Design a protein around this ligand. Sequence first.
Ligand SMILES: COc1ncccc1CC(=O)N1CCC[C@@H](C(N)=O)C1
Ligand SMILES: [Zn+2]
Length: 139
Amino acid sequence: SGAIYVGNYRVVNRHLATHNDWANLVWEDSSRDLLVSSTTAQGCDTIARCDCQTGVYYCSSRRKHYPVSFSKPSLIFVEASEYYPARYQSHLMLAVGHSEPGDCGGILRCQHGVVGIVSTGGNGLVGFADVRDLLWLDE
Ligand SMILES: COc1ncccc1CC(=O)N1CCC[C@@H](C(N)=O)C1
Ligand SMILES: [Zn+2]
């Protein structure tokens, strides 16, 4: 689990979005595993606006943060789950590291701010859904 709170928005993994998230829907993209809902309180997370390929992510299954090198956002093939059939997930970044399903939502950060959230894993690779291109989260 995990979310990003920025301005009057809440960014979550689309597959973990709640009834409240869907009742206050702003934008969702199944191909990215992202959903943004509106909030009443003001969030103060800072979104990174950069091309960093190194950062640190929170891994709840180890209660630890790990430093990683990660690929630029791209279309990557992802195996089926109870939420999606096998498909290409877009805007995804991979790194070598540990993850388990419950780790989705963990934040990846660089020196500039939030980069994305854990969204996929398997075979010793962890994938992060990028949010740096969503310039509207700040306005
Ligand atoms: C962090 O996730 C994992 N890590 C290790 C093993 C397995 C996982 C689960 C995984 O990959 N998922 C979770 C359900 C949604 C799927 C998607 N985005 O298409 C991805
Ligand atoms: Zn950065």
